[PDB]
Amino acid sequence: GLMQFTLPVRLCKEIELFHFDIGPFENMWPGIFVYMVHRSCGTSCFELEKLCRFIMSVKKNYRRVPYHNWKHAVTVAHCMYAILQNNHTLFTDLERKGLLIACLCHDLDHRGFSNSYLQKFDHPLAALYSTSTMEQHHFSQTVSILQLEGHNIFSTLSSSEYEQVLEIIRKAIIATDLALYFGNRKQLEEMYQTGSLNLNNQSHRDRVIGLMMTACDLCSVTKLWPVTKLTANDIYAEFWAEGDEMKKLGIQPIPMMDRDKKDEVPQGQLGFYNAVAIPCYTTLTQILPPTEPLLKACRDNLSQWEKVIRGEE
Ligand SMILES: COCc1cnn(C)c1C(=O)Nc1ccn2nc(-c3ccccc3)nc2c1
Numbered sequence: 001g002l003m004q005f006t007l008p009v010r011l012c013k014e015i016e017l018f019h020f021d022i023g024p025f026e027n028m029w030p031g032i033f034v035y036m037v038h039r040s041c042g043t044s045c046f047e048l049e050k051l052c053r054f055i056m057s058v059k060k061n062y063r064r065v066p067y068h069n070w071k072h073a074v075t076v077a078h079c080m081y082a083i084l085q086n087n088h089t090l091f092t093d094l095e096r097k098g099l100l101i102a103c104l105c106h107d108l109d110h111r112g113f114s115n116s117y118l119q120k121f122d123h124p125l126a127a128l129y130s131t132s133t134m135e136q137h138h139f140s141q142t143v144s145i146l147q148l149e150g151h152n153i154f155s156t157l158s159s160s161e162y163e164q165v166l167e168i169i170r171k172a173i174i175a176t177d178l179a180l181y182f183g184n185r186k187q188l189e190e191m192y193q194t195g196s197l198n199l200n201n202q203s204h205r206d207r208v209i210g211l212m213m214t215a216c217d218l219c220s221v222t223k224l225w226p227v228t229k230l231t232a233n234d235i236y237a238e239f240w241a242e243g244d245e246m247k248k249l250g251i252q253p254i255p256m257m258d259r260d261k262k263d264e265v266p267q268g269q270l271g272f273y274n275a276v277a278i279p280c281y282t283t284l285t286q287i288l289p290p291t292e293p294l295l296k297a298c299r300d301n302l303s304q305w306e307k308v309i310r311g312e313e
């Protein structure tokens with residue numbers, strides 16, 4: 001109860017910033033996560049034994065793929081932690097608790113292939129979940145881990161709260177299906193400009209949390225240029241492996257996934273920042289003003305990619 005987690009001074013300060021990078025030292029990521037739950041939620045949100053056991057069954061069920069791994073899980077959870085600290089009074093105790101848990105869990109047991117590939121390969125997960133295939137698998141793994149003995153970090157919630165937290169987490173994890181982002185952001189844009197956006201309306205809270213989730217998921221683009229650039233290598237190492245595999249099933253893959261189309265990567269980063277990230281961070285800044293530094297940083301990295309194309313690095 002009387003056991004603070006700290007962090008050395010550079011981390012203690014840089015962690016509160018949106019562009020913080022959790023670094024190359026794996027063995028600190030759990031302590032970083034716990035440090036965030038504590039400052040965001042209080043030392044009393046979670047029995048320390050149950051949380052430490054949950055954090056390590058989660059870690060152990062992420063795979064060692066180049067991008068969709070334990071380090072992405074914690075990065076995503078960090079960005080969420082930033083958003084919540086900068087808007088601390090807009091969210092319930094249940095929302096704060098389950099959204100960081102949602103983010104640590106959001107890619108559980110990912111294999112490093114798109115929903116798309118699962119369906120083209122006819123993987124059993126695509127027979128059991130026809131849309132948001134991996135994302136329903138993700139929530140499903142989270143519940144599995146939650147039901148291991150000693151793992152139920154939610155044990156001490158009323159029966160009511162418990163069902164509402166699992167519903168927040170479920171909805172939150174589904175939202176990271178980027179195919180649902182476009183619909184969601186459009187409606188949020190319109191609802192905001194027609195002054196109809198109502199945060200006591202629960203289905204409006206849902207769309208906002210959906211958007212935060214996309215924001216945190218995509219936060220590689222809000223980092224210092226060299227973090228942004230080296231993360232894109234990891235991203236393409238998955239995409240081009242998926243492409244290879246498409247080819248092995250006898251299918252031309254989309255250019256994104258074709259390692260014979262490396263030369264066009266800056267062009268596709270631009271498309272990506274213009275069709276996806278900029279609009280994501282724009283609407284989110286409109287809705288939660290103190291998220292602006294994600295927007296600002298995202299535009300800086302768009303401008304670094306432009307610089308690449310022009311041969312200026
Ligand atoms: C779904 O995105 C996940 C994600 C998360 N964080 N980031 C930076 C990404 C991310 O790079 N996305 C995208 C999107 C669209 N294209 N098109 C290309 C491309 C097209 C033609 C030729 C070569 C490449 N490369 C990407 C990368």
Ligand SMILES: [Mg+2]
Pocket residue numbers: 106107134176
């Ligand atoms: Mg995912």
Ligand SMILES: [Zn+2]
Pocket residue numbers: 072076106107176217
């Ligand atoms: Zn993710």
